[PDB]
Design an enzyme around this catalytic site. Structure first.
Site, PDB file in Angstrom:
ATOM      1  N   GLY A  24      68.608  99.644  67.907  1.00 62.90           N
ATOM      2  CA  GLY A  24      67.455  99.884  67.087  1.00 62.90           C
ATOM      3  C   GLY A  24      66.717 101.220  67.612  1.00 62.90           C
ATOM      4  N   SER A  25      65.516 101.301  67.011  1.00 63.01           N
ATOM      5  CA  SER A  25      64.694 102.385  66.995  1.00 63.01           C
ATOM      6  C   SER A  25      64.245 102.889  68.420  1.00 63.01           C
ATOM      7  CB  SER A  25      63.594 102.528  66.118  1.00 63.01           C
ATOM      8  OG  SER A  25      62.808 101.440  66.088  1.00 63.01           O
ATOM      9  N   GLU A  27      65.461 101.932  71.109  1.00 68.49           N
ATOM     10  CA  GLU A  27      66.634 102.147  72.301  1.00 68.49           C
ATOM     11  C   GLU A  27      67.420 103.646  71.925  1.00 68.49           C
ATOM     12  OE1 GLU A  27      66.602  99.095  70.277  1.00 68.49           O
ATOM     13  OE2 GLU A  27      65.143  98.621  71.586  1.00 68.49           O
ATOM     14  N   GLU A  46      72.387  89.244  68.602  1.00 63.80           N
ATOM     15  CA  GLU A  46      72.266  89.368  70.113  1.00 63.80           C
ATOM     16  C   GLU A  46      72.760  87.943  70.844  1.00 63.80           C
ATOM     17  OE1 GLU A  46      70.107  89.734  67.553  1.00 63.80           O
ATOM     18  OE2 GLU A  46      69.495  92.193  67.807  1.00 63.80           O
ATOM     19  N   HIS A  69      67.190  94.877  71.252  1.00 64.49           N
ATOM     20  CA  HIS A  69      65.981  95.369  70.389  1.00 64.49           C
ATOM     21  C   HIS A  69      64.797  94.942  70.490  1.00 64.49           C
ATOM     22  CE1 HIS A  69      64.015  98.004  67.657  1.00 64.49           C
ATOM     23  NE2 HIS A  69      63.880  97.022  66.789  1.00 64.49           N
ATOM     24  N   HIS A 280      74.621  63.972  82.616  1.00 59.33           N
ATOM     25  CA  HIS A 280      74.455  64.043  81.150  1.00 59.33           C
ATOM     26  C   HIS A 280      74.061  62.867  80.435  1.00 59.33           C
ATOM     27  CE1 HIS A 280      76.505  66.186  77.165  1.00 59.33           C
ATOM     28  NE2 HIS A 280      75.155  65.539  77.034  1.00 59.33           N
ATOM     29  N   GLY A 400      75.161  73.663  78.262  1.00 56.17           N
ATOM     30  CA  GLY A 400      75.474  72.944  77.277  1.00 56.17           C
ATOM     31  C   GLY A 400      75.147  73.283  75.844  1.00 56.17           C
TER      32      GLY A 400
HETATM   33  C1  LIG Z   1      76.254  64.294  72.327  1.00 61.58           C
HETATM   34  O1  LIG Z   1      76.114  65.642  72.138  1.00 61.58           O
HETATM   35  P1  LIG Z   1      75.044  66.710  72.747  1.00 61.58           P
HETATM   36  O2  LIG Z   1      74.796  66.096  74.091  1.00 61.58           O
HETATM   37  O3  LIG Z   1      73.798  66.644  71.714  1.00 61.58           O
HETATM   38  C2  LIG Z   1      75.505  68.573  72.880  1.00 61.58           C
HETATM   39  O4  LIG Z   1      74.328  68.985  73.236  1.00 61.58           O
HETATM   40  C3  LIG Z   1      76.617  68.619  73.798  1.00 61.58           C
HETATM   41  C4  LIG Z   1      76.662  69.770  74.555  1.00 61.58           C
HETATM   42  C5  LIG Z   1      77.719  69.625  75.750  1.00 61.58           C
HETATM   43  C6  LIG Z   1      78.608  68.802  75.637  1.00 61.58           C
HETATM   44  C7  LIG Z   1      78.780  67.605  74.797  1.00 61.58           C
HETATM   45  C8  LIG Z   1      77.743  67.693  73.970  1.00 61.58           C
HETATM   46  C9  LIG Z   1      75.995  68.738  71.126  1.00 61.58           C
HETATM   47  S1  LIG Z   1      77.591  68.300  70.736  1.00 61.58           S
HETATM   48  C10 LIG Z   1      77.414  68.872  69.179  1.00 61.58           C
HETATM   49  C11 LIG Z   1      78.654  68.684  68.221  1.00 61.58           C
HETATM   50  C12 LIG Z   1      79.803  69.964  68.364  1.00 61.58           C
HETATM   51  O5  LIG Z   1      80.799  69.492  67.318  1.00 61.58           O
HETATM   52  P2  LIG Z   1      81.955  70.273  67.262  1.00 61.58           P
HETATM   53  O6  LIG Z   1      82.609  70.138  65.837  1.00 61.58           O
HETATM   54  O7  LIG Z   1      82.102  71.937  67.655  1.00 61.58           O
HETATM   55  O8  LIG Z   1      82.953  69.423  68.414  1.00 61.58           O
HETATM   56  P3  LIG Z   1      83.290  67.810  68.166  1.00 61.58           P
HETATM   57  O9  LIG Z   1      81.993  66.958  68.941  1.00 61.58           O
HETATM   58  O10 LIG Z   1      83.597  67.259  66.697  1.00 61.58           O
HETATM   59  O11 LIG Z   1      84.599  67.436  69.068  1.00 61.58           O
HETATM   60  C13 LIG Z   1      76.265  69.255  69.073  1.00 61.58           C
HETATM   61  C14 LIG Z   1      75.768  69.703  67.833  1.00 61.58           C
HETATM   62  N1  LIG Z   1      75.511  69.151  70.170  1.00 61.58           N
HETATM   63  C15 LIG Z   1      73.618  69.704  70.137  1.00 61.58           C
HETATM   64  C16 LIG Z   1      73.476  70.951  70.178  1.00 61.58           C
HETATM   65  C17 LIG Z   1      73.005  71.561  69.057  1.00 61.58           C
HETATM   66  N2  LIG Z   1      72.674  72.905  69.049  1.00 61.58           N
HETATM   67  C18 LIG Z   1      72.989  73.606  70.111  1.00 61.58           C
HETATM   68  C19 LIG Z   1      72.645  75.163  70.026  1.00 61.58           C
HETATM   69  N3  LIG Z   1      73.385  73.067  71.367  1.00 61.58           N
HETATM   70  C20 LIG Z   1      73.878  71.888  71.458  1.00 61.58           C
HETATM   71  N4  LIG Z   1      74.314  71.397  72.496  1.00 61.58           N
HETATM   72  C1  LIG Z   2      64.828 102.437  62.120  1.00 64.38           C
HETATM   73  O1  LIG Z   2      65.196 100.744  62.308  1.00 64.38           O
HETATM   74  P1  LIG Z   2      64.589  99.871  63.515  1.00 64.38           P
HETATM   75  O2  LIG Z   2      63.122 100.175  63.542  1.00 64.38           O
HETATM   76  O3  LIG Z   2      65.476  99.878  64.675  1.00 64.38           O
HETATM   77  C2  LIG Z   2      64.739  98.004  62.495  1.00 64.38           C
HETATM   78  O4  LIG Z   2      64.099  97.578  63.614  1.00 64.38           O
HETATM   79  C3  LIG Z   2      63.823  98.046  61.393  1.00 64.38           C
HETATM   80  C4  LIG Z   2      63.130  96.843  61.149  1.00 64.38           C
HETATM   81  C5  LIG Z   2      62.518  96.852  60.051  1.00 64.38           C
HETATM   82  C6  LIG Z   2      62.328  97.824  59.118  1.00 64.38           C
HETATM   83  C7  LIG Z   2      63.224  98.901  59.261  1.00 64.38           C
HETATM   84  C8  LIG Z   2      63.781  99.052  60.392  1.00 64.38           C
HETATM   85  C9  LIG Z   2      66.187  97.763  62.128  1.00 64.38           C
HETATM   86  S1  LIG Z   2      66.911  98.298  60.832  1.00 64.38           S
HETATM   87  C10 LIG Z   2      68.460  97.945  61.209  1.00 64.38           C
HETATM   88  C11 LIG Z   2      69.614  98.316  60.292  1.00 64.38           C
HETATM   89  C12 LIG Z   2      69.647  97.307  59.366  1.00 64.38           C
HETATM   90  O5  LIG Z   2      70.956  97.640  58.294  1.00 64.38           O
HETATM   91  P2  LIG Z   2      71.376  97.033  57.013  1.00 64.38           P
HETATM   92  O6  LIG Z   2      72.771  97.496  56.654  1.00 64.38           O
HETATM   93  O7  LIG Z   2      70.853  95.918  56.859  1.00 64.38           O
HETATM   94  O8  LIG Z   2      70.337  98.114  56.043  1.00 64.38           O
HETATM   95  P3  LIG Z   2      70.422  99.492  55.704  1.00 64.38           P
HETATM   96  O9  LIG Z   2      69.637 100.334  56.881  1.00 64.38           O
HETATM   97  O10 LIG Z   2      71.844 100.190  55.790  1.00 64.38           O
HETATM   98  O11 LIG Z   2      69.836  99.818  54.370  1.00 64.38           O
HETATM   99  C13 LIG Z   2      68.366  97.742  62.549  1.00 64.38           C
HETATM  100  C14 LIG Z   2      69.644  97.364  63.476  1.00 64.38           C
HETATM  101  N1  LIG Z   2      67.157  97.652  62.989  1.00 64.38           N
HETATM  102  C15 LIG Z   2      67.012  96.965  64.603  1.00 64.38           C
HETATM  103  C16 LIG Z   2      67.234  95.650  64.595  1.00 64.38           C
HETATM  104  C17 LIG Z   2      68.161  95.262  65.489  1.00 64.38           C
HETATM  105  N2  LIG Z   2      68.149  93.800  66.030  1.00 64.38           N
HETATM  106  C18 LIG Z   2      67.135  92.720  65.388  1.00 64.38           C
HETATM  107  C19 LIG Z   2      67.086  91.342  65.529  1.00 64.38           C
HETATM  108  N3  LIG Z   2      66.299  93.408  64.618  1.00 64.38           N
HETATM  109  C20 LIG Z   2      66.277  94.655  64.248  1.00 64.38           C
HETATM  110  N4  LIG Z   2      65.107  95.012  63.575  1.00 64.38           N
END
Ligand SMILES: COP(=O)(O)[C@@](O)(c1ccccc1)c1sc(CCOP(=O)(O)OP(=O)(O)O)c(C)[n+]1Cc1cnc(C)nc1N
Ligand SMILES: COP(=O)(O)[C@@](O)(c1ccccc1)c1sc(CCOP(=O)(O)OP(=O)(O)O)c(C)[n+]1Cc1cnc(C)nc1N
Ligand SMILES: COP(=O)(O)[C@@](O)(c1ccccc1)c1sc(CCOP(=O)(O)OP(=O)(O)O)c(C)[n+]1Cc1cnc(C)nc1N
Ligand SMILES: COP(=O)(O)[C@@](O)(c1ccccc1)c1sc(CCOP(=O)(O)OP(=O)(O)O)c(C)[n+]1Cc1cnc(C)nc1N
Ligand SMILES: [Cl-]
Ligand SMILES: [Cl-]
Ligand SMILES: [Cl-]
Ligand SMILES: [Cl-]
Ligand SMILES: [Cl-]
Ligand SMILES: [Cl-]
Ligand SMILES: [Cl-]
Ligand SMILES: [Cl-]
Ligand SMILES: [Mg+2]
Ligand SMILES: [Mg+2]
Ligand SMILES: [Mg+2]
EC number: 4.1.1.7
Lengths: 523, 523, 523
Positions: A24-25, A27, A46, A69, A280, A400
């Site tokens: 991003g800008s 960086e 990210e 960024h 767990h 987890g």
């Molecule tokens: C009983 O499951 P939980 O204890 O809830 C879970 O946290 C977990 C984590 C590690 C090991 C086992 C379960 C799990 S397991 C789980 C399901 C993943 O399903 P997937 O289809 O990948 O495998 P399976 O269960 O069918 O074999 C979810 C959604 N979560 C909650 C969760 C949601 N969002 C994020 C970003 N992370 C998470 N862990």
């Molecule tokens: C000059 O660009 P920047 O000022 O760096 C940017 O932050 C930005 C934000 C709002 C308006 C304009 C630019 C932008 S614009 C940008 C490119 C997106 O490209 P895209 O292909 O979607 O459209 P275009 O530029 O080709 O028309 C990025 C990566 N970023 C940095 C960035 C990275 N990761 C995340 C989560 N958010 C972000 N904003």
């Protein structure tokens, strides 16, 4: 010299040669004039950037360097940082800030109160008070990440700093060596050795920090000398022991009562490189039964403080394992007998049982394969059915947090080009960091992705049935075409709807020169 | 058992028998039914409570336990906490919270967002999610305070918790032992030892963690073997070396250029138990001159990370000092010659020069006296003129926060009843924690307080003159009658307006059975 | 111009002309060349600095400016900041930081992670990223402190910034006017007015923000029109109503059940300028009885969010009180009858009953006296026995943190030189900020301090008796000679051991030209 020039000389002198990032800008003044002795690895979101860097750091056993960024980029990666904290991963996370002149007015892309953003998931978090201080702050970040207990750190840098002059005394930073390779003093170490030598029925429990230290072979020597059974601590992020060695007893279930029952009758339990313990499910009971004393060796004071039972020693796992393995006497007790091989479950000509999938992988994969697990309902079966003989052979999300295994598999494969990486990922879990597939395609990193498609969040259905929670929404994920997603990001896409198709597709994937995704229809 | 009963048993089993406190309503359920084997030490304001506890912990080389009243009590003690962080003092700070039923409405005496209040001045800060968790949280606090690098911690407890039932599994907490007594592995220690043996002209620099560890005698042996001069690191909170040993070269001035000039010509400089370095004045220049290599041994990863030069090893100071002292060869070079005696300054029959006060204390005080310093303009002369032969003989505010020495001298004297404590304190510094005097009176703790009355904030005037800062307000403190303040709190009050009065008043104070304050008229 | 010059111009243009402080090296470049149109008020410890500034701000109804020394100075003041948060006091707190070039190495007097230190007790906390940002950051601080709901704010400034060059565009900051003087839209205000007019038995409850807004007389008009009884909300920091007006019903006890019983039979209760409610003791019950509707007008969204019952409107108290008072109809109901005079308690020729002290003060003090209360066991009797006819006549520690009233009485007297200030303070409470007396002596600020000496923490003994809590240590404070403490800091000292001596000493104090402390022997 400039801050830009001085900082890249510090990085190379400290052994860093790769930047993981999404740009991003704020960086651009860091990334411009990118030196010829470094490489940049791009990912499209990210969570994926950090996941890739995390796998690379874990397999390489050295720090990884990340560039994100401002607040939006940092925030998109905070689930990934949750895992990295739990795995003690040495990650140096840098994020670009607005020019110092526009911070006050809160221009777009100002990271407000920036040092507080990633907390509590980092060891150290800082924004320098001046441009000339930036190399010193980077030195602090490198060493805070690398010292035991290793972990992620955060540095926010205003984009106008890079072109300014560096402190002329910055050169003293370049060759600093900092060591935490320490072990218990001779007198108290002799006391521990005597306690192990005189135990009548010792047991050993190993955690992820054994594998991080490459202390695996010394722990094998120790368990052979003591004739002791060996378990892996619950919710295991890594594999610390050969899984077909005669002393190995498998993965402990993550319950209070379940673990106290396994340890009953053992007079001394030695835990090395694990928290005590990463439970767990709620499985209330005794922490330890009468007649068992526990002694923990950990690299992390926070682990030592919070254990509800036992004595503890805070030290380097490599140094301690080596000392113990070479000092203990050879016991004349009978060596443990190996666990029996798992039964072959019935399989018809339709959808695959998970057990079938793991048995097929074990028959066909190279002996030095590396596995990653994010198939959350099949973990017990996986640990029983895969022979992992070498260090650095298994990775599972340490906090987890789903979205780890897909990107981490790409970084592991980058670190270990001569070892085939195979990521076993559920249909639900695959979506969290789906865009990481693009990096494997673009850099031709030949990871194999095995998608376990059962149509549901299986592990959640199981927890609900247990809890007797009825009428719960949001448990099923029908209508996702994983071969089309793979095509979307340029990765070769194969199917396995039955056992003969699984065998063929795996043969092909093992022979491929680029990454391959296989969508498996599971029961 | 109740949470109350379980918690006091944990404290006694971990060696704690004393509660330093100022009470309130949220603390009544903790303090009621106070056990007959414990003692409570009351102070009238919370800066005094924590200062007293801090001197007691530093001198005893063990943790001290504190109890304060919600946010108001905790906040009044936060300057005190700043010093304790810098001295690595193992303090367990507890604060009472409102009953859980009224936390949400924010009744009077609710500590809002309690765990965030004392940050960043503590190693760990917590409020438990249930009454039954209280004993486990207290165990975590005790170990977090005691593990290397030692430091203050904070625990907030809702008042309705103490009468609730404890979990029977809390018994596993009582006898937990946690060790951080670690040193560098043999292979790398032998490399260090070879480097010291090969040096042509080595120097040693010692800091406060040597004295905290009682490593002083080992450092003496090390210096004698290497035939090396020894300095104390700048801004010194403790005295780590006998001040008339022939190797001793004094307190380093707290400036960048001053320290690099002192170390010129020395090819290897070994620093033990200090930050690198605690500078104060801005004295810009080289961190080290060419051809000087620095190696630091420190118990604190935060110190190792931020040093702008040299190699570092993170380990226990006691363990490393003993190992090095016993492994290095006896050098064939000549032992350093002792520093000459300082000159006697001219003194008429009127107000006392500081130099005269220190020469008189040195002539009259026992060889095992313990000194505290908060006379900010006279520190260099104090270090030159007092012969301190033994460990535990000197304390100075580690973060430069005034209000330390007066209460700390009372805690040191409580910890060391057979060593005479003598606190030398400026007229400005005396007021910050003046009410601490009452505690010495009520408990008959026989500390001697020597007030250096020059009528001004002397150190500040000196700083302003160096910067040629003119027209600065608030530098003088006329019209304070220290003998009346002493009488206000029940402490015997003597005066010294000339040298003969000083000699008489000191002889009396040394013979006294209670605390004595002497108001000295200084130039 | 320099940052120093530009910052003092911003301050004077925004109406600031006084700095309350305790100085140090990091503040010398700010305080040098101190301008001729400013005054500096020195106090000997930072709890005192902030309490003095707080009383000044509260009485003047305008912001106060504070300058402290790094983390040690800031930390010493954080109990004082607890009170200021609860009273919504507009305080601008500045603290000096090390030079930018030594922040990273953590030299002595470096404020580590400075913006986090005072949280959660401030509305806004900040350290600027460059010297040229300092004037803009100061403008933000001034406005954040002054906007409704008013409160304390914190700014940390590296000492090398002041001599640097300011941006000429900083001139736009000098005359900025920011208003929060808002009230409810006409349509919804007409709905509220109709509800008040239609009520059969309305009641009114007033809090400290009424007095801060000088809305007192508008509240009298409102009460007279509606023919409604008026209470002061519990734990009262200020007095919002004339205490002998026929509608006045006194201070509400700080309990849940007590308050719902007082409001029983009142169909509509209008709360203005208070939290709902600042309970203290746990007195469980109904928040309101079934026939009572509550409507709260508050200037603080945090108060409106946390009320467990009733409707709320977030707006300026002055603006809302004026609008309501002029729109409501004159009711045909009977005006409430005035509370009868309290009875005279029996009193012999020995130690004084608190009731006797308050009756004597009421008889002898001017009708426009200003009282402060930190005599914690006597508050209910004080509110019954003192006729306070005018605004700005009462102050009590808003967060219950002792050490407020002694310094605050000095700041109130500085703000209101034509009204006699009389601070009624208990023997325990006096010690927390005792060194504040020196500031009254040095600047000749003629506050009268009445010390209620009962030899104990009386309110704590009462609370313990109610809990039936026995064997509690630390409840008594014998052996303090308050006349000697007064002499120590240069303040005239009188005694009152019986009623005749109390009458005499009060007559003397009322006639005095400097500050006077009277030590009263109470039962
Ligand atoms: C009983 O499951 P939980 O204890 O809830 C879970 O946290 C977990 C984590 C590690 C090991 C086992 C379960 C799990 S397991 C789980 C399901 C993943 O399903 P997937 O289809 O990948 O495998 P399976 O269960 O069918 O074999 C979810 C959604 N979560 C909650 C969760 C949601 N969002 C994020 C970003 N992370 C998470 N862990
Ligand atoms: C000059 O660009 P920047 O000022 O760096 C940017 O932050 C930005 C934000 C709002 C308006 C304009 C630019 C932008 S614009 C940008 C490119 C997106 O490209 P895209 O292909 O979607 O459209 P275009 O530029 O080709 O028309 C990025 C990566 N970023 C940095 C960035 C990275 N990761 C995340 C989560 N958010 C972000 N904003
Ligand atoms: C029942 O008393 P509590 O609810 O504990 C208390 O917090 C309090 C506050 C306001 C009103 C009533 C009591 C009180 S009242 C109190 C005693 C003050 O004694 P003092 O002699 O001043 O008056 P009295 O009680 O004899 O009339 C104490 C120590 N505290 C605890 C406390 C300790 N340290 C600090 C910094 N602030 C505090 N408030
Ligand atoms: C040059 O002095 P500085 O660098 O400002 C100071 O911080 C300091 C600290 C340690 C050593 C030397 C000076 C000092 S020294 C100092 C004066 C103390 O005067 P005192 O009369 O006690 O002794 P002397 O100087 O006359 O011999 C002050 C007010 N300060 C600032 C200060 C203010 N408030 C609190 C809570 N703590 C502080 N340290
Ligand atoms: Cl050893
Ligand atoms: Cl392949
Ligand atoms: Cl804080
Ligand atoms: Cl070794
Ligand atoms: Cl004595
Ligand atoms: Cl900050
Ligand atoms: Cl309108
Ligand atoms: Cl008067
Ligand atoms: Mg699934
Ligand atoms: Mg002085
Ligand atoms: Mg009292």
């Amino acid at each position: 010299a400039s801050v830009h020039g001085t900082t890249y000389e510090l990085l190379r002198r400290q052994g860093i040669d790769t930047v993981f990032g999404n740009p991003g800008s704020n960086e651009l003044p860091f990334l411009k004039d990118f030196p010829e002795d470094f490489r940049y690895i791009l990912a499209l979101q990210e969570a994926c950037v950090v996941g890739i860097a995390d796998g690379y750091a874990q397999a390489s056993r050295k720090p990884a360097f990340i560039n994100l960024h401002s607040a939006a980029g940092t925030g998109n990666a905070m689930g990934a940082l949750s895992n990295a904290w739990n795995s003690h991963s040495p990650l140096i996370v840098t994020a670009g800030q607005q020019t110092r002149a526009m911070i006050g007015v809160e221009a777009l892309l100002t990271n407000v109160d920036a040092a507080n953003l990633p907390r509590p998931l980092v060891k150290w978090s800082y924004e320098p008070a001046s441009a000339a201080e930036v190399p010193h702050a980077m030195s602090r970040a490198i060493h805070m990440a690398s010292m035991a207990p290793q972990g992620p750190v955060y540095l926010s840098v205003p984009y106008d700093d890079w072109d300014k002059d560096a402190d002329p005394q910055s050169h003293h930073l370049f060759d600093r060596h900092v060591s935490s390779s320490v072990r218990l003093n001779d007198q108290d170490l002799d006391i521990l050795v005597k306690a192990l030598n005189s135990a009548s029925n010792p047991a050993i429990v190993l955690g992820p920090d054994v594998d991080a230290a490459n202390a695996n072979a010394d722990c094998v020597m120790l368990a052979e000398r003591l004739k002791a059974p060996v378990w892996v601590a619950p919710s295991a992020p890594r594999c610390p022991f050969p899984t077909r060695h005669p002393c190995f007893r498998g993965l402990m279930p993550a319950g209070i009562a379940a673990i106290s029952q396994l340890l009953e009758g053992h007079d001394v339990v030695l835990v090395i490189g694990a928290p005590v313990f990463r439970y767990h499910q709620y499985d209330p009971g005794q922490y330890l039964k009468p007649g068992t004393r526990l002694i923990s060796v950990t690299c992390d004071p926070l682990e030592a403080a919070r254990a509800p039972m036992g004595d503890a020693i805070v030290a380097d796992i490599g140094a301690m394992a080596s000392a113990l393995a070479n000092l203990v006497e050879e016991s004349s007790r009978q060596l443990p007998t190996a666990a029996p091989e798992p039964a072959k479950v019935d399989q018809d000509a339709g959808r695959l049982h998970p057990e079938t999938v793991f048995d097929t992988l074990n028959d066909m994969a190279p002996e030095n394969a590396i596995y990653l697990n994010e198939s959350t309902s099949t973990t017990a079966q996986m640990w029983q059915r895969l022979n992992m003989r070498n260090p650095g052979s298994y990775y599972f999300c340490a906090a987890g947090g789903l979205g780890f295994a897909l990107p981490a598999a790409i970084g592991v494969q980058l670190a270990e080009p001569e070892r085939q990486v195979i990521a076993v990922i559920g249909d639900g879990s695959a979506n969290y960091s789906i865009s990481a597939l693009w990096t494997a395609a673009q850099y031709n990193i030949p990871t194999i992705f095995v998608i376990m498609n059962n149509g549901t969040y299986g592990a959640l259905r199981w927890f609900a049935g247990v809890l007797e929670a009825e009428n719960v929404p949001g448990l099923d994920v029908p209508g996702i075409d994983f071969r089309a997603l793979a095509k979307g990001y340029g990765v070769q896409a194969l199917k396995a709807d039955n056992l003969e198709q699984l065998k063929g597709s795996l043969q092909e994937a093992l022979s491929a020169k680029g990454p391959v995704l296989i969508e498996v229809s599971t029961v």
